[model samples]
Target: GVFNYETETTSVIPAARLFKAFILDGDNLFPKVAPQAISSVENIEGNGGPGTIKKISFPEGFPFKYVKDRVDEVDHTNFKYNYSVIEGGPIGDTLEKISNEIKIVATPDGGSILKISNKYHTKGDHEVKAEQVKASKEMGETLLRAVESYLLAHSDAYN
Candidate 1:
């Protein structure tokens, strides 16, 4: 059994507002900013709330379409959510497993920090640890910058 794990964090100007832009409004922002990274982030089935199901795709250049459903979530208080890719796509068949968890927490002050950590496994002789690290770090920073930019333009949304 093999596992690849990584964590990324960003210090935001306003913690509560940043949380709202990312976790609360991810359904609207992800595809808009990075269509190549995330094709579709939709609440395909179920309650579409804290504990729900959703589908994610990587599009033409991307390898697989992961339809991951939310297994657990804790709103506002803890601000944590977890999900796993259950079904296999064309490229998914080659991988052993892939799962991710994203946490958005507000600091004691008026700032917020968003952390995205994930664990992925591949059925291969060689380990792609570098690639994993790069992807995780890149995704983390990109999300933070994107959210911050969005919040900057839409001040009313947060206030």
Candidate 2:
């Protein structure tokens, strides 16, 4: 069975600015924010656009070594990003594959609301526990908050 998880968070950061930082410059900013969770993100194939495959490596002590994700859709104009985790430790274990779709929309208050949808495909009769999803969501939230703090401090960054 497949499990669907949805989460949304509002940030004071602008939508375009946040997207530029989180989606475009993710390889550079992710390591800075969560050095413990993510060691590095390297583009293994393609030219950093659709069909591009990136390998996200975790720190040495992490349970899962790394995961490979493919960029399926990236719409800068609409501030939308779609990716799928096609391989790694999580695959075949906790899930067969995790597909993520993120959309950053502008709020009336000059901020942005980030909507994230996660679809977890389980293996065989396996089912994903709620805690696992929560943990993953929290990790992403931490990263986003870190990025927001960094951008707020820098001010000129991502603008």
Candidate 3:
């Protein structure tokens, strides 16, 4: 089954800055800022283009392990990002895949208006377990905190 989701968020930092760490360098930088949430994210294959594979490792405190994910495409000039997600690795059962495409637009206050369009696919039931969605929501907030906190801590970064 497949479903669609949409959400919007705002950021105090400019879109350009958020794009750098969130979209461009998130795989490597997210784990650095929030060590307790994510174990690590690493490149599995390919270059920086559409076929590149990246994997995110989870620590001890989450449900449903998802390992391998891929990068679709990134717009370096316009700050639009395309990415996909996969779960249920190590056993190849439990869930299927999730897709998230993120974009950021600059606001007048020198901040950002972030938006996400998601299409998640699963093999069997489409309702999805409670914790499954919990993990999903948590990861989003964690990313926000990770990127926001990391940028503020290091003022010289992506400025």
Candidate 4:
């Protein structure tokens, strides 16, 4: 089966700046912002663009050991990113994969409107529970807030 999970948020950070720090520079900035959850982001192949594979390692208290995803598309000029989780706890035994697309747009107020869409592809007729979707959304919200707080505190960052 197929389903969608989406989140929309407004941030005081500019779209380009936030996208640069949160997505483009994520490999270098995530651990610094959420060390308790994500331990590291390692680039396994490619040049940090489309077709690149990166492994994300979580801390002991987190659910998974690591999640590996490939960057499917990255539109630097538009502040859009797309990736697919090929291997991860989020995929579970019943899921084929999870694809995510994120778009950050500049607001008239000089901030940003960030939207994330997640498409879950399940294996066969295995059903995906609502709780699973909620948990994943919660995790994503937590990470986003953590990064947002870090950037807010360090306002000079990603300028």
C-alpha TM-scores of all predictions: 0.72, 0.93, 0.87, 0.91
Please give the clash total of every predicted structure, in order: 2, 0, 0, 0
Report each candidate's C-alpha RMSD, comma-separated, in the order given: 3.3, 1.4, 2.2, 1.5
Q: In model 1, what lDDT does residue 151 have?
A: 74
Q: Show model 4 residue runs off by greater than 4 Å.
A: none
How many steric clashes does model 1 contain?
A: 2
Residues 14-112 of candidate 1 have per-residue lDDT tens digits of 665666667677777877876666777878776646557677666676545565646556466576766665555522545555566777766777676
lDDT of each: 0.64, 0.89, 0.77, 0.86
- lDDT of candidate 3 at residue 12, scale 0 to 100: 86
Give me the displacement of residue 22 in model 4, in angstroms. Answer: 0.6
lDDT of 3 by residue, 1-159 (tens): 776777788888889999988888888887888877778888889886787888788777665354777788888787888877754442245456777788899999998988887776766664665555556666777788778988988999986
TM-score of 2: 0.93
RMSD of 2: 1.4
Q: How many backbone clashes does candidate 4 have?
A: 0
Poorest 10 consecutive residues of model 2 by lDDT?
89-98
Better of 1 and 3 by TM-score: 3
Models sorted by lDDT, best on top: 2, 4, 3, 1
